[PDB]
């Protein structure tokens, strides 16, 4: 399970960085609780197009 983050979130968080997180933590807390999202690739651009249409 990978998923990219929304909010801060401790020991990993970063408003949209690319973290690899244990299966459960995510499908059980990180989401269905807004704080991250399946790195569905459709997303790794969806949320990289920011790291371009922004930080440059």
């Amino acid at each position: 399970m990978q998923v990219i983050l929304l909010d801060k979130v401790a020991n990993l968080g970063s408003l949209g960085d690319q973290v690899n997180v244990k299966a459960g933590y995510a499908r059980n807390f990180l989401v269905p609780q807004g704080k991250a999202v399946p790195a569905t690739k459709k997303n790794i651009e969806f949320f990289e197009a920011r790291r371009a249409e922004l930080e440059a």
Binding site: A23, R27, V31, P32, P38
Partner: protein, 77 residues
């Protein structure tokens, strides 16, 4: 009905097989669990009866998409 709501997995039959190679009818059955999935698209908890694997399928494809089927296929949820 030990049956995975997402993947179709039901129990299957096979043999056991001693060293003596003795056939004895058995059953393999799905690692089922029935989980409380958060939808939000419905602001609710749909709880499916799932196989780890089904769960992986949900974890991939995505819940709203899985729930898409079933409904697409008549199933309850």
């Amino acid at each position: 009905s030990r049956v995975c709501q997402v993947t179709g997995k039901r129990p299957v039959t096979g043999n056991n097989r001693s060293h003596a190679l003795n056939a004895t009818k058995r059953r393999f059955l799905p690692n089922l669990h029935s989980h409380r999935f958060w939808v939000e698209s419905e602001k609710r908890f749909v709880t499916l009866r799932v196989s780890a694997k089904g769960m992986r399928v949900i974890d991939k494809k995505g819940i709203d998409t899985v729930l898409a089927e079933l409904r697409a296929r008549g199933e309850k949820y």
